[PDB]
UniProtKB/Swiss-Prot annotation, chain A:
UniProt biased composition (Basic residues): 1-10
Subunit structure comment from the entry: The nucleosome is a histone octamer containing two molecules each of H2A, H2B, H3 and H4 assembled in one H3-H4 heterotetramer and two H2A-H2B heterodimers. The octamer wraps approximately 147 bp of DNA.
Similarity remark: Belongs to the histone H2A family.
Cell location: Nucleus; Chromosome
Modified residues (N5-methylglutamine): Q96
Positions bearing N6-(beta-hydroxybutyryl)lysine: K1, K5, K28, K87, K110
Record's keyword annotation contains Phosphoprotein: yes
Gene Ontology CC annotations of this record: CENP-A containing nucleosome; extracellular exosome; nucleosome; nucleus
Post-translational modification N6-glutaryllysine, affected residues: K87, K110, K111, K117
Function statement: Core component of nucleosome. Nucleosomes wrap and compact DNA into chromatin, limiting DNA accessibility to the cellular machineries which require DNA as a template. Histones thereby play a central role in transcription regulation, DNA repair, DNA replication and chromosomal stability. DNA accessibility is regulated via a complex set of post-translational modifications of histones, also called histone code, and nucleosome remodeling.
Keyword field contains Metal-binding: no
InterPro entries: Histone-fold, Histone_H2A, Histone_H2A/H2B/H3, Histone_H2A_C, Histone_H2A_CS
Record-given protein name: Histone H2A type 1-B/E
From Swiss-Prot, chains B, F:
Organism: Homo sapiens (Human)
Sites of the Glycyl lysine isopeptide (Lys-Gly) (interchain with G-Cter in ubiquitin) crosslink: K71
Top-level taxon: Eukaryota
Family of this protein: Belongs to the histone H4 family.
Gene coding for it: H4C1
Name recorded for this polypeptide: Histone H4
Modified residues (N6-(2-hydroxyisobutyryl)lysine): K11, K24, K39, K57, K59, K71
Modified residues (N6-glutaryllysine): K11, K39, K57, K59, K71
Modification sites for N6-succinyllysine: K11, K57, K59, K71
Swiss-Prot record, chain C:
Phosphothreonine modified-residue sites: T85
A GO term for molecular function: structural constituent of chromatin
Cross-link position per record: Glycyl lysine isopeptide (Lys-Gly) (interchain with G-Cter in ubiquitin): K4, K90
Domain of life: Eukaryota
Residues with PTM N6-acetyllysine: K55
Residues with N6-(2-hydroxyisobutyryl)lysine modification: K4, K13, K16, K27, K55, K78, K86, K90
GO cellular component, one term: nucleoplasm
Taxonomic source organism: Homo sapiens
Official protein name in the record: Histone H2B type 1-J
Residues of the full protein shown: 32 to 126 of 126
Subcellular location: Nucleus; Chromosome
Modification comment: Monoubiquitination at Lys-4 (H2BK34Ub) by the MSL1/MSL2 dimer is required for histone H3 'Lys-4' (H3K4me) and 'Lys-79' (H3K79me) methylation and transcription activation at specific gene loci, such as HOXA9 and MEIS1 loci. Similarly, monoubiquitination at Lys-90 (H2BK120Ub) by the RNF20/40 complex gives a specific tag for epigenetic transcriptional activation and is also prerequisite for histone H3 'Lys-4' and 'Lys-79' methylation. It also functions cooperatively with the FACT dimer to stimulate elongation by RNA polymerase II.
Keyword Methyltransferase among record annotations: no
Main location: nucleus
Residues bearing the modification N6-crotonyllysine: K4
Swiss-Prot record, chains D, E:
Family, similarity comment: Belongs to the histone H3 family.
Disease tied to this protein: Glioma: Gliomas are benign or malignant central nervous system neoplasms derived from glial cells. They comprise astrocytomas and glioblastoma multiforme that are derived from astrocytes, oligodendrogliomas derived from oligodendrocytes and ependymomas derived from ependymocytes. The mechanism through which mutations lead to tumorigenesis involves altered histones methylation with gain of global H3K27 methylation, altered Polycomb repressive complex 1 (PRC1) activity, aberrant epigenetic regulation of gene expression and impaired differentiation of mesenchimal progenitor cells.
Residue(s) carrying Phosphotyrosine: Y4
Residues of the full protein shown: 39 to 136 of 136
Residues modified to N6-glutaryllysine: K19, K42, K78, K85
Modified residues (N6,N6-dimethyllysine): K42
Location of Phosphoserine modifications: S20, S49
Modification N6-crotonyllysine occurs at: K19
Positions of modified residues (N6-(2-hydroxyisobutyryl)lysine): K19, K27, K42, K85
PTM sites of type N6-acetyllysine: K19, K42, K78, K85
Identification of the protein by name: Histone H3.1
Subunit structure: The nucleosome is a histone octamer containing two molecules each of H2A, H2B, H3 and H4 assembled in one H3-H4 heterotetramer and two H2A-H2B heterodimers. The octamer wraps approximately 147 bp of DNA. Interacts with TONSL; CHAF1A; CHAF1B; MCM2 and DNAJC9. Interacts with NASP; NASP is a histone chaperone that stabilizes and maintains a soluble pool of Histone H3-H4 dimers.
Organism per entry: Homo sapiens (Human)
Length: 117, 82, 95, 98, 98, 82, 97, 55
């Protein structure tokens, strides 16, 4: 026997997420009796894309705040500032997320503000 | 002397929360209503949490119990595991 | 000693892929992990229901794709679907 | 003495707390309330500290959202003052019948 | 000529339709709307008749519920006349953002 | 001549529905808004229905497709099987 | 010769109907609604019990899981009476071997 | 062998709902790897109670 050298399925797929673990997680959880080989690949790819999208937007918010470390605040801001993620996570609570600086136009003081210039 | 302890959710804390809610002006009767609302909300969550607790034959309420209770009420919480 | 799995390392790799000069808090990583867990369960459960509805005993990439189309809106779904498709084709190619 | 008009400080407070994310309710009375209520279901129960923090997060997010809907109802009613009836309406519409 | 005051017949109609359960929308235009919309997603699709009846049931129950919430918002606003803003508020509170 | 067919959800039908909704008085602008609301609602349901349809490799939309679409939108319907 | 076989809970609902109110029928549409109801609550309970079992690393679904699921899903006195009946049934089953 | 007369679980439970069908429905659907004997009994009992209340 030859016993060719090991290569993981993510690398074969050109991915970073663990395809094998996703497969294991699918097997364990009473989702189906059997699971096809491409399904965990597809799902892992989806999870990877969505993670990249969130991290990208959160880093954008960080730079906006002159911060080098991603914090929950940026994730909440990112989510609520994105129409599609907001829909997806409309009924989701982000711990330590706070809220958006959204003030209704009618509660702010009048154009009689006293400083024309 | 204490007052059933629900009073520790004080008026200024509720005021702060309403301010985060964007509220500029608040009737004085709002506070007790909010407390009542909170108790109902809380009761249901904790009730379910304890049910999960009881199922596990545990005497310590975990964060996961809360998370599951919240999920089944359609109030998914992120950040505490799971 | 016990053993607790997470997606931390993959998120960190992705963060370095998209933004090499940026960190992330542990709490935020936990939030990302929670997110991942939630979407995983949502997708698998929906796929399960479809398969049941179609008297199908197998979960394939077809069910995943369909579930995604049901759950995700417009361009997000389209890009995710395109990526999954590309990934499966790459997997099938490099045997 | 110098004197600010009504609303200016309220608005400043809004901006302050909406910029930040720290919890606005005191930890200890919340723990005591939780423990009392839970005690009424089952005796001598314990709680993890992070469970209490989670409960607080959920509670506060729920309350701000209710106050937001309340505020919209008030504005809808041509008011700036929130009333019990506004809360009752918002909760009724979400189906939080109670 | 004999003449009823405004509201009496409306109330009678309310009582009549709230006592009954028959569908109030015409079958054919509903089928045509459905077919047109579905056509915009995929061509030459067919529909089971009971599927259309199901869609109609769902649609009408959804609409009465929205009008109920709208009515409560109007009454809350000291009105008896429903307005777009009332619907918009009710839908916003349910999270039917659209 | 026809008018994109959305107009077949006529004013009196909407009036009847509002009456069942307990509405006594109705602004004239409500009707178009309701139509728009219906289209959005409908689109999402039908969209999902067709997705289920497409998954089954069928060219006929079934009641079950509608039922599943409705369930996933939290609008469970009883009476049509399943 | 071809034929299929569609199962339903119709006969049991009718038997119960005859048990509680002997002089009363039920339409087919209404029976269909009752069958839909039964299927929905079945799925709800099994799914919730399954999730609890997974949370507790348990491979078995027991009467405890049914009870707990009921306690989570059903309210107050409805839950209490259902629970009592279920308990009664298991106790009757266990003795009647 | 004797092969005694065929009794059923619903009759033993003193119930009207079909224990056997519920068991099969539980088995089929990816709910758990294994299913205890009382679970379908309990569930059936609950369903019967609720039906009676509604009817």
């Amino acid at each position: 026997k030859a016993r060719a050298k090991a290569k993981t399925r993510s690398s074969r797929a050109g991915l970073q997420f663990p395809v094998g673990r996703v497969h294991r997680l699918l097997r364990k959880g009473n989702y189906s009796e059997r699971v096809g080989a491409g399904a965990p690949v597809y799902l892992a790819a989806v999870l990877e894309y969505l993670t990249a999208e969130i991290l990208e937007l959160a880093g954008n918010a960080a730079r906006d705040n002159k911060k080098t470390r991603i914090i929950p605040r940026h994730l909440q801001l990112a989510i609520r500032n994105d129409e599609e993620l907001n829909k997806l996570l409309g009924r989701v609570t982000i711990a330590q997320g706070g809220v958006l600086p959204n003030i209704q136009a009618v509660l702010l003081p009048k154009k009689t503000e006293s400083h024309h210039k | 002397v204490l007052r059933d302890n629900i009073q520790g959710i004080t008026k200024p804390a509720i005021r702060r929360l309403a301010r985060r809610g964007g509220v500029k002006r608040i009737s004085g009767l709002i506070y007790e209503e909010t407390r009542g609302v909170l108790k109902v909300f809380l009761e249901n969550v904790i009730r379910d949490a304890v049910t999960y607790t009881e199922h596990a034959k545990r005497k310590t309420v975990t964060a996961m119990d809360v998370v599951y209770a919240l999920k089944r009420q359609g109030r998914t919480l992120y950040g505490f595991g799971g | 000693r016990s053993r607790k799995e997470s997606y931390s390392i993959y998120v960190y790799k992705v963060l370095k892929q998209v933004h090499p000069d940026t960190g992330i808090s542990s709490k935020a990583m936990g939030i990302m992990n929670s997110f991942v867990n939630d979407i995983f369960e949502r997708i698998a459960g929906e796929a399960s229901r479809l398969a049941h509805y179609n008297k199908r005993s197998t979960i394939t990439s077809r069910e995943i794709q369909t579930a995604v189309r049901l759950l995700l809106p417009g361009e997000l779904a389209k890009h995710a679907v395109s990526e999954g498709t590309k990934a499966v084709t790459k997997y099938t190619s490099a045997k | 003495p110098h004197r600010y008009r009504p609303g200016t400080v309220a608005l400043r407070e809004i901006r302050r707390y909406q910029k930040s994310t720290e919890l606005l309710i005191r930890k200890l009375p919340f723990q005591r309330l939780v423990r009392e209520i839970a005690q009424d279901f089952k005796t001598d129960l314990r709680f993890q500290s992070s469970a209490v923090m989670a409960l607080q997060e959920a509670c506060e997010a729920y309350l701000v959202g209710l106050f937001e809907d309340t505020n919209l109802c008030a504005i809808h009613a041509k008011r700036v003052t929130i009333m019990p009836k506004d809360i009752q309406l918002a909760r009724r519409i979400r189906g939080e019948r109670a």
